[PDB]
Design a protein around this ligand. Structure first.
Ligand SMILES: [Zn+2]
Length: 70
């Protein structure tokens, strides 16, 4: 829907790694971008290899628009 804060999504299970928040569930603190994870980080939900994670900085959403932007 709307992401960009270095939020990565596991294409293997659908988990979302939070960099600024850190993988508190895996052991990684916040203030850390996914690109800085360990050389072999595993998903805390599906245990997949960090290489299975993929960023997602895109915003898609639009169901109603009764206006013309000014
Ligand atoms: Zn996963």
């Amino acid at each position: 829907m709307e992401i960009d804060e270095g939020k990565y999504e596991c294409e293997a299970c659908g988990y979302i790694y939070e960099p600024e928040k850190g993988d508190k569930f895996a052991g990684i603190p916040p203030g850390t971008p996914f690109v800085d994870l360990s050389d072999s980080f595993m998903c805390p939900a599906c245990r997949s290899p960090k290489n299975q994670f993929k960023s997602i900085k895109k915003v898609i959403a639009g169901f109603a628009e009764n206006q013309k932007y000014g």
